[PDB]
Design a protein around this ligand. Structure first.
Ligand SMILES: CCCCCCCCCCCCCCCCCC(=O)OC[C@H](COP(=O)([O-])OCC(O)COP(=O)([O-])OC[C@@H](COC(=O)CCCCCCCCCCCCCCCCC)OC(=O)CCCCCCCCCCCCCCCCC)OC(=O)CCCCCCCCCCCCCCCCC
Ligand SMILES: CCCCCCCCCCCCCCCCCC(=O)OC[C@H](COP(=O)([O-])OCC(O)COP(=O)([O-])OC[C@@H](COC(=O)CCCCCCCCCCCCCCCCC)OC(=O)CCCCCCCCCCCCCCCCC)OC(=O)CCCCCCCCCCCCCCCCC
Ligand SMILES: CCCCCCCCCCCCCCCCCC(=O)OC[C@H](COP(=O)([O-])OCC(O)COP(=O)([O-])OC[C@@H](COC(=O)CCCCCCCCCCCCCCCCC)OC(=O)CCCCCCCCCCCCCCCCC)OC(=O)CCCCCCCCCCCCCCCCC
Ligand SMILES: CCCCCCCCCCCCCCCCC[C@@H](O)O[C@H](CO[C@H](O)CCCCCCCCCCCCCCC)COP(=O)(O)OCC[N+](C)(C)C
Ligand SMILES: CCCCCCCC/C=C\CCCCCCCC(=O)OC[C@H](COP(=O)(O)OCCN)OC(=O)CCCCCCC/C=C\CCCCCCCC
Ligand SMILES: CCCCCCCC/C=C\CCCCCCCC(=O)O[C@H](COC(=O)CCCCCCC/C=C/CCCCCCCC)COP(=O)(O)OCCN
Ligand SMILES: CCCCCCCCCCCC(=O)SCCNC(=O)CCNC(=O)[C@H](O)C(C)(C)COP(=O)(O)O
Lengths: 128, 178, 459, 88, 603, 103
């Protein structure tokens, strides 16, 4: 027996330590076979369009188009106002503004009070 | 790298992979050659004791505690060959690799230099132009219906035929072009 | 001032009477000549102004903006020469007409002795840009982008007209000289607060202020290259110029009125710089960088100190030049790839080394590397904000670090690594594109030798 | 660099040298085309150690998927020449 | 008239001629590296004269030749400070650069872009000279950023390698973290002292407050890679060996220590900032030596050695001994540059192999590199009457007899022991055992460029300490009388380091193997700092930047507030208004209702 | 284990084609056809155009333009020790207080 390795979000589990790979069933083998089948179909299509001497352009990638479209333009039509979204939006969009306003207002009120009281010693402070 | 991958790894391949990894990391731990030879022979002796075991369940239970033991003592800084995916010169020369089609955009004053090379290039272009038209039909007739089941390609079977999808494997830039 | 205005007007009949194959050459030559004439305006005095007539004046705040506006047109023509090759002669002439009209409106806007004339021209600039965006645009979202760009600006600027007519009814004049000499303090009143808001929001929305910047990414991404160049270089500076001109009557109300906008800009520069880190589009990244720079300019104008004003002027000029160059580089990549996606075309330094050098110089200038005027404005504004409050330094430093981060990210993603294998239509860079980048970049490094030319009237 | 341009003859000579230094396999019996499992009666573990010895000899490392189907010295030499782009 | 100024400006000016000729024909030929090397050697032999004049008399000058701009009461001009520090550092930097360039003429012979590489080295040198001789804060900032940009460009020299780009961006990130404090200091000095000039700052700051000195300390820690911002320096080894020998070993990385030296009149009037400087230096040197003790890459080991030496330099700054820190800078330049030269020669001779597990007996196979590395290791460990003696021994003596922390002194002593220890590790694992490199031997030293470049720095690392120490005027009170055990403490700890390291290394021959402990794992992964601080913060910033700043706020809520709400309300009102069936019944009923309302509500 | 016959044949044909291509990548003796057209000695010219000329311009620039303005070049005052004499004035600094010398 040896000390156990505990995975985390930023340190994933090694492939050789997965109990899933050791639980082999015919369904798992068929799933792997069809995964490699679709991968081989995609690779065949890409290489057929890649080795063609006639093509003199960019091979359009539907996966890339879908990625960019989902990241940019598909957000709002799928947006639904929920307690989670409302609370997170309110926090992340209002809290920092009021926090910084409080900080700067307190600092400037302190500075103005010191200036009015005259105890700040602003000698040589010419450029502002 | 060159060989097409399989849908899965069998038990025997996994055992070989663990054996290679353990030997490499033991060599990394044991710097000196005589010590490494001694401990590698001892590792082989410990490794082949369960060679003749027969049932699948105990075999699968083994190699697993072996992988855990390997991970516990895996030498967090193993030796890596300089050109390996983790080496100090893995992709050092990848900025010097220029594609072959870039020569098609050279100015005629530049193509005036090296005339024999460009004549040979034109001959290669003609060969590719014919071979591609042959290869498309050859691959269409040879592929199983419903799409390929593996990313392995067949060789050429006729006399004047060339292996399908050969242009971008034969015309690699180089390992160290500059 | 008419020695600049009349040739710009004569550009139109010259364009419309040109041969079918000589429009670009004539337009470029005469635009460059007009720019040379504009150089004379830079000589400025430490005294009041260059009051040419009752209608127009020039100042060391207006002179650099006028020079940049006159210089931008030949570059826009050079950039537009490419993608308009398959266009009919009449429509190309119409495009050149739109560009000339936009230049004329901007030139008359920057002199503008009287505020209603300034408003009229500041709104007249809206039509040619809208036509350019919604007519010669590639995608189908250009219509929505133009609608956003029109309606944000108009909603912001309609109360400004009411504020201006009220100010003229009360004071009696809107000439800037009389306004400056007869200025009176604003009492802390609700009516004065709303007058301040009506005077400020029109220029805030065009900066763009954070939270009111939604129109800018749409308009910049969907516009043709010339439209993006002009929008990023000159049209954003109209709000800053207007704020600098109009904050003379908003005192002492500005001391406490500025806080909501100061907080918004100070947090929004961080927000937009962080947004730039996760972006899949070059144009969107450049637009958000522009938003960050203009937010920092807003902070400078709101602080309302001499160093703030000098830094704001310098940063406006430097940002205009840098954003124009970055947009031009992105367009050069797009006309080869037709995708406008960062991750598609990679490792272009191997294929195009000189264009990679241009990319590096543009990124270094956007990164505010000394002694470029970008850092001159950045540092002056940072010092003024520190004098305003010592706690601003944290936000300024965070913004600087994130700015360097996404600038070098944009450089590395496109220029370094391994080339994309299946892309084989990347032809050598033309002399036109190289000359465009050179004419963008050389004025910056020449201006860093004479920074007093772009430091504004408070130098 | 100053690296001599190694040839096919050098690769074959070095492979056969390292193989003849392997005491398990008799020097006389082995031939460029001599198979590993059947012609010389070696185990698969012997094959992986042979691959490792090749790796240490030539200073570069072969992926496992390619190594597990290298069964003759001739195809080992062919693989090395293809990897290092050897002309003759 | 007074050739001091003319010569000092002439050196910097003639350093820039090959940059102007980079567009000429010589740049397209193979004579460009020799041209640049000759220019650097001429600049060095020219700059040797003002140092001689200062040694004779002590000449000190300020040259404000060109007036760039004036903002109100603040005047900014191109001003050069040519004090002791400048006239002493310029010859050393030029000598090291000349040696490194002659070495690069051999090392980078097969690189297609060597003219460019040479041009970049010249550009970096010019920027560093700008940094060193600057008289105001703006010029020194110009040099500060120029050296950083040259570091970014030279680290990612092989731009096809992902790790090189990652290391370059890491260096940029850490240097910007330092730039934050630099900008804070500039803003404070301009606001309060009304100047960026050094003379006015020295006059108007008799009791310097905490804020500008803390900003300066942050900038120095950022650029000198102190414990908080250390990891970028070891990662900067991705670049070519000459780059690591010139920039990240002896010239660029001492910039923060030099900045703290330049502001020493204000540093001595503050006691808290001195304490923070001392603690930072001590923790940096200890942690970096502990990281170095167990590394297998030779370049990584030597880089951690450089970081530990910088930590010792900042300890010296913390104990209020700036001139001693400058002397240590000068000595470390020589011997660390030569150590990188030897490491690069070893790497090239073994087919670009860097790991020490695959290099064995090189003491006899290649003896000139062996003797040079042995002399450099002896110099590094403060062997008596050697370049490292005249600085490191004084550092230890001054720390031992000063009113300072006990912890910092203990950490410094342990760092010295660990320094001896990893020097022993390098020698033992690189030169003593049986060979472990591939059978095809390609070992060769017989190249005049490499031999001459190494031997010049060898003569330097043997005699420069004595020469410089005996030629400069005194600048601090000496430690004349000392306890005998306190006088030998440096030698005692160093010999203890040799003995313990050698004893522990000799056990690797034994035929026993045990799994590593937790302390070894901690030391090998550099205290797990790179893993945690490169996976957690970066992920948390990027995830927020995508989810909240980009999507949640910008693409959703800001869009919902003004435009979507306006569109929805206007569309609903349009539907309500325009949904009329066209029946005059309802229309005139509404007219009747409307007529009644007007009569009764408006009068 | 091992290659399938199809894999063997494909690898053989591919490696033959690759060797043919690599051989074709070589150059003939006349391949770099260069078109010609025009329109201590090394150290001596170098020491004039790279050292003497720059120092002439800088000395002229410093001696006649930079020093034309005040305070442009400021020099640290020379140290004065007891027993020294001054070229400008000629007076001699008196010696010190004859400290008791021993060891
Ligand atoms: C400009 C620069 C940067 C700016 C950043 C931009 C940020 C600005 C945008 C901020 C937007 C945040 C607020 C959005 C409005 C919330 C309501 C909404 O969106 O409707 C959708 C939605 C209506 O849909 P629905 O069909 O009625 O129900 C769907 C829900 O799944 C069904 O939910 P349920 O039935 O479970 O709800 C029960 C309960 C929710 O229970 C909870 O757990 C949350 C209570 C806390 O609700 C309450 O009790 C209300 C309290 O409302 C919600 O579902 C959630 C409502 C509760 C959210 C609380 C609001 C957040 C507080 C923000 C206020 C702070 C400033 C306000 C200023 C006002 C004066 C000027
Ligand atoms: C330091 C003094 C220098 C004196 C010599 C005069 C140099 C004249 C340069 C004029 C401006 C450059 C124009 C930009 C585009 C370059 C054109 C080009 O494509 O070159 C092809 C040409 C032919 O090569 P190729 O093989 O055919 O092309 C292959 C690829 O292009 C591959 O080409 P590559 O790999 O060789 O890369 C191209 C190269 C060229 O591209 C560049 O990036 C150069 C531009 C860098 C500036 C970036 C903006 C940052 C703000 C600086 C603004 C200050 C400007 C001062 C006034 C400028 C007047 C126009 O990039 C670099 O080498 C890396 C640049 C990083 C340097 C960072 C240090 C900057 C701050 C230093 C302080 C400067 C003032 C000192 C104040 C205190 C002392 C008094 O190569 C060159 O001639 C290189 C240009 C010379 C290098 C310039 C480096 C420093 C000079 C900056 C401006 C002058 C400072 C005045 C002080 C004098 C004392
Ligand atoms: C005042 C009186 C003055 C006289 C003082 C006495 C004179 C000397 C007495 C001797 C004392 C010890 C000297 C021997 C050093 C140890 C060597 C050793 O045995 O290493 C092998 C051994 C395991 O090796 P391995 O796992 O088999 O590695 C496999 C191969 O060997 C892999 O091997 P490789 O080939 O890969 O690399 C070999 C490398 C690899 O070896 C290592 O792994 C290095 C790790 C041990 C060395 C680190 C020692 C430095 C101590 C600084 C720590 C500061 C505090 C840090 C606080 C941490 C907080 C968690 O080893 C070396 O190269 C040599 C190591 C250093 C020896 C040479 C210099 C030692 C003299 C300087 C130390 C003291 C004298 C100061 C002089 C001034 C006079 C005062 O390492 C240890 O077991 C560590 C021993 C001591 C560690 C103490 C820290 C434990 C902390 C645990 C937690 C405690 C509670 C904390 C609670 C906190 C709550 C907030
Ligand atoms: C959406 C993306 C950003 C868009 C731009 C946002 C910027 C616009 C924000 C406007 C700035 C502030 C407006 C008024 C500031 C005056 C200070 C006042 O509000 O504070 C207190 C005022 O107290 C209370 O706040 C009274 C007002 C309460 C009603 C206001 C609604 C609060 C939230 C509304 C926000 C909606 C903004 C978006 C509109 C669509 C001071 O108390 P008091 O001494 O008595 O009044 C001093 C003024 N006097 C002297 C003239 C009398
Ligand atoms: C070259 C070959 C030709 C040789 C013949 C010329 C010999 C020298 C005679 C030159 C005449 C003297 C002269 O140059 O005039 C002074 C003139 C300055 O102009 P002024 O009006 O007097 O004052 C400045 C503000 N108005 O000096 C010069 O311009 C020449 C030398 C300038 C200094 C060198 C500048 C190099 C760096 C470029 C700027 C870098 C950016 C700014 C950095 C800011 C740092 C704080
Ligand atoms: C991007 C969209 C932004 C749109 C602009 C938002 C702000 C608009 C500014 C407020 C609108 C009215 C401007 C006022 C015009 C100037 C005239 C003036 O200042 O005189 C005031 C007039 O002040 C008013 O009447 C203001 C009444 C406001 C009615 C219209 C409300 C519009 C919305 C107000 C709330 C939102 C304002 C900020 C929006 C934030 C950004 C979205 C005093 O009038 P007198 O009676 O003559 O003198 C008093 C002594 N007898
Ligand atoms: C320093 C690192 C730490 C070290 C820790 C590692 C621990 C490893 C110890 C585990 C030992 C085992 O093999 S675990 C036992 C798992 N089960 C079996 O081995 C059953 C059948 N064996 C095979 O099939 C093999 O492939 C074989 C016949 C050998 C070759 O065959 P070839 O004829 O196809 O070469």
């Amino acid at each position: 027996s040896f000390p156990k390795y505990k995975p985390s979000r930023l340190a994933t589990l090694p492939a050789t330590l997965d109990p899933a790979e050791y639980d082999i069933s015919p369904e798992t083998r068929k799933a792997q076979a069809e995964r490699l089948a679709i991968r081989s179909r995609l690779k065949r299509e890409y290489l057929l369009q890649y080795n063609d001497p006639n093509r003199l352009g960019v091979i359009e990638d539907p996966a890339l188009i879908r990625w960019t479209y989902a990241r940019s333009a598909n957000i709002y039509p799928n947006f639904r106002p929920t307690p989670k979204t409302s609370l997170l939006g309110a926090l992340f969009g209002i809290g920092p503004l009021f926090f910084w306003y409080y900080v700067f207002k307190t600092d400037r009120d302190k500075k103005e009070k010191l200036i009015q009281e005259g105890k700040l010693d602003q000698t040589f402070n010419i450029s502002y | 790298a060159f060989s097409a991958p399989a849908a899965y790894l069998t038990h025997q391949q996994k055992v070989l992979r663990l054996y290679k990894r353990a030997l490499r990391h033991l060599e990394s731990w044991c710097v000196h050659r005589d010590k490494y030879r001694y401990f590698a022979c001892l590792m082989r002796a410990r490794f082949d004791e369960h060679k003749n075991e027969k049932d699948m369940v105990k075999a699968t239970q083994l190699l697993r505690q072996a992988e855990e033991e390997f991970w516990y003592g895996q030498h967090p800084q193993p030796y890596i060959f300089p050109e390996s995916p983790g080496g100090t010169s893995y992709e050092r020369y990848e900025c010097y690799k220029v594609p072959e089609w870039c020569l098609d955009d050279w100015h005629p004053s530049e193509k005036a230099m090296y005339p024999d090379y460009f004549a040979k290039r034109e001959q290669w272009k003609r060969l590719r132009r014919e071979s591609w038209e042959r290869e498309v039909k050859q691959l269409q007739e040879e592929t199983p219906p419903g799409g390929p089941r593996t990313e392995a390609l067949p060789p050429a079977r006729k006399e004047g035929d060339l292996p399908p999808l050969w242009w971008h494997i034969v015309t690699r830039p180089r390992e160290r072009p500059m | 001032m008419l020695k600049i205005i009349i040739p710009t007007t004569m550009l139109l009949p010259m364009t419309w009477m040109s041969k079918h194959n000589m429009i670009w050459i004539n337009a470029t030559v005469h635009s460059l000549l007009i720019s040379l004439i504009s150089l004379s305006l830079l000589n400025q005095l430490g005294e009041n102004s260059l009051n040419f007539s009752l209608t127009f004046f020039s100042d060391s705040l207006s002179a650099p903006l006028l020079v940049l506006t006159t210089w931008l047109l030949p570059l826009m023509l050079m950039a537009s020469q490419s993608h308009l090759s398959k266009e009919t002669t009449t429509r190309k002439k119409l495009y050149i007409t739109m560009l000339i009209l936009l230049q004329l409106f901007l030139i008359m806007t920057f002199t503008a002795t009287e505020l209603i004339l300034f408003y009229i021209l500041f709104e007249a600039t809206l039509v040619p840009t809208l036509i350019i965006i919604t007519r010669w645009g590639n995608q189908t979202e250009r219509l929505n982008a133009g609608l956003y760009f029109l309606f944000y600006t108009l909603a912001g600027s309609l109360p400004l007209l009411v504020a201006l007519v009220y100010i003229q009814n009360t004071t009696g004049s809107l000439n800037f000289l009389i306004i400056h000499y007869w200025s009176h303090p604003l009492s802390n009143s609700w009516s004065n607060i709303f007058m301040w808001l009506a005077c400020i929001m029109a220029f805030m929305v065009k900066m763009p202020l954070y939270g009111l910047h939604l129109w800018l990414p749409k308009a910049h991404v969907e516009a043709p290259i010339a439209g993006s160049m002009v929008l990023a270089a000159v049209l954003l500076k109209l709000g800053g110029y207007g704020m600098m001109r109009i904050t003379t009557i908003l005192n002492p109300l500005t001391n406490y009125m500025a806080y909501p906008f100061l907080m918004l800009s100070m947090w929004g520069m961080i927000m937009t710089s962080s947004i730039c880190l996760r972006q899949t589009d070059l144009k969107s990244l450049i637009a958000y960088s522009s938003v960050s720079h203009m937010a920092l300019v807003i902070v400078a104008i709101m602080i309302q100190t001499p160093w703030s004003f000098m830094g704001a002027t310098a940063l406006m000029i430097a940002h205009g030049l840098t954003s124009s160059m970055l947009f031009c580089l992105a367009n050069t990549n797009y006309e080869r790839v037709h995708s406008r996606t960062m991750i598609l075309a990679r490792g272009l330094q191997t294929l195009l080394p000189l264009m990679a050098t241009w990319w590096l110089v543009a990124s270094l200038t956007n990164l505010a590397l000394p002694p470029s005027i970008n850092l001159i404005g950045e540092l002056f504004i940072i010092t003024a904000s520190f004098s305003w409050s010592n706690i601003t330094i944290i936000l300024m430093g965070m913004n600087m670090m994130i700015t360097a981060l996404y600038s070098l990210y944009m450089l590395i993603t496109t220029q370094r690594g391994k080339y994309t294998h299946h892309i084989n239509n990347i032809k050598p860079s033309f002399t036109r594109e190289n000359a465009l980048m050179a004419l963008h970049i050389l004025p910056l490094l020449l201006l860093t030798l004479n920074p007093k030319m772009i430091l504004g009237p408070l130098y | 660099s100053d690296a001599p341009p190694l040839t096919l003859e050098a690769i074959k000579d070095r492979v056969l040298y390292v193989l003849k230094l392997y005491d398990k396999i008799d020097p006389e019996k082995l031939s460029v085309n001599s198979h590993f499992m059947k012609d010389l009666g070696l185990d698969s573990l012997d094959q992986v150690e042979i691959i490792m010895a090749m790796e240490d000899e030539f200073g570069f490392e072969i992926p496992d998927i390619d190594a597990e189907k290298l069964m003759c010295p001739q195809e080992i030499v062919d693989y090395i020449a293809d990897k290092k782009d050897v002309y003759e | 008239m007074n050739p001091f100024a003319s010569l000092t400006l002439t050196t910097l000016t003639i350093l820039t001629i090959p940059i102007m000729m980079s567009n000429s024909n010589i740049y397209k030929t193979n004579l460009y590296p020799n041209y640049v090397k000759t220019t650097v050697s001429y600049a060095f032999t020219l700059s040797l004269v003002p140092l001689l004049m200062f040694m004779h008399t002590g000449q000190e000058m300020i040259i404000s030749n060109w007036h760039w701009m004036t903002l109100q009461t603040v005047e900014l001009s191109l001003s050069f400070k040519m004090d002791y520090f400048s006239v002493m550092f310029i010859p050393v930097a030029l000598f090291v650069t000349w040696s490194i360039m002659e070495f690069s003429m051999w090392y980078m012979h097969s690189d297609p872009f060597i003219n460019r590489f040479f041009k970049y080295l010249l550009l970096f040198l010019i920027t560093m000279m700008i940094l060193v001789t600057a008289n105001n804060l703006f010029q020194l900032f110009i040099g500060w950023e120029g050296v950083g940009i040259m570091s970014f460009l030279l680290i990612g020299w092989w731009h096809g390698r992902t790790d090189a780009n990652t290391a370059a961006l890491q260096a940029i990130l850490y240097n910007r973290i330092g730039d934050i404090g630099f900008v804070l200091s500039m803003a404070w000095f301009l606001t309060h002292s009304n100047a960026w000039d050094l003379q006015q700052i020295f006059m108007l700051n008799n009791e310097c407050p905490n804020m500008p000195l803390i900003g300066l300390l942050l900038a120095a820690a950022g650029k000198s890679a102190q414990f908080g911002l250390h990891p970028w320096l070891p990662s900067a080894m991705e670049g070519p060996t000459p780059v690591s020998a010139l920039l990240h070993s002896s010239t660029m990385v001492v910039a923060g220590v030099f900045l703290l030296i330049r502001f020493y009149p204000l540093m001595e009037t503050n006691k808290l900032v001195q304490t923070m400087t001392l603690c930072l230096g001590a923790i940096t040197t200890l942690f970096t030596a502990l990281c170095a003790i167990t590394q297998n890459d030779i370049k990584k080991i030597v880089a951690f050695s450089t970081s530990s030496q910088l930590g010792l330099m900042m300890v010296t700054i913390g104990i209020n001994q700036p001139h001693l820190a400058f002397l240590h800078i000068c000595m470390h330049a020589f011997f660390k540059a030569m150590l990188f030269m030897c490491s690069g020669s070893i790497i090239h001779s073994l087919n670009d192999e860097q790991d020490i597990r695959k290099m064995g007996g090189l003491y006899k196979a290649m003896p000139f590199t062996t003797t040079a590395l042995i002399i450099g290791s002896l110099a590094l460990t403060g062997m008596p009457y050697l370049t490292g003696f005249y600085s490191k021994d004084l550092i230890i003596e001054a720390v031992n007899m000063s009113y300072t922390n006990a912890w910092a002194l203990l950490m410094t002593l342990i760092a010295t022991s660990l320094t001896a220890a990893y020097s022993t590790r390098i020698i033992f694992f690189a030169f003593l055992g049986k060979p472990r490199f591939p059978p095809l031997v390609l070992i060769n030293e017989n190249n005049p460029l490499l031999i001459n470049s190494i031997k010049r720095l060898l003569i330097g690392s043997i005699f420069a300490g004595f020469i410089i120490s005996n030629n400069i005027p005194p600048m601090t009170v000496p430690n004349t009388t000392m306890p005998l055990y306190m006088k030998m403490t440096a030698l005692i700890v160093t010999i203890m380091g040799f003995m313990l390291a050698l004893e522990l290394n000799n056990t690797t021959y034994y035929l026993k193997f045990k799994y590593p402990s937790q302390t070894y794992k901690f030391s090998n992964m550099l205290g797990y700092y790179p893993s945690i601080m490169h996976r957690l913060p970066t992920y948390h910033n990027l995830s927020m930047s995508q989810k909240s700043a980009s999507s949640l706020l910008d693409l959703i809520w800001l869009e919902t507030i003004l435009p979507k709400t306006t569109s929805f309300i206007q569309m609903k009102m349009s539907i309500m208004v325009s949904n009329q069936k066209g029946l005059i019944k309802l229309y005139f009923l509404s007219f009747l209702i409307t007529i009644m309302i007007s009569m009764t509500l408006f009068n | 284990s091992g290659y399938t016959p199809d894999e063997k044949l494909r690898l053989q044909q591919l490696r033959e084609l690759r060797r043919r291509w690599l051989k074709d990548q070589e150059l003939s003796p006349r391949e770099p056809v260069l078109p010609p057209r025009r329109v201590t000695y090394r150290h001596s010219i170098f020491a004039v155009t790279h050292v003497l000329i720059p120092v002439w311009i800088i000395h002229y620039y410093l001696k006649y333009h930079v020093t034309a303005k005040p305070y442009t070049v400021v020099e640290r005052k020379p140290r004065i020790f007891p027993g020294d004499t001054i070229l400008e004035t000629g007076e001699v600094i008196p010696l010190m207080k004859e400290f008791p010398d021993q060891h």
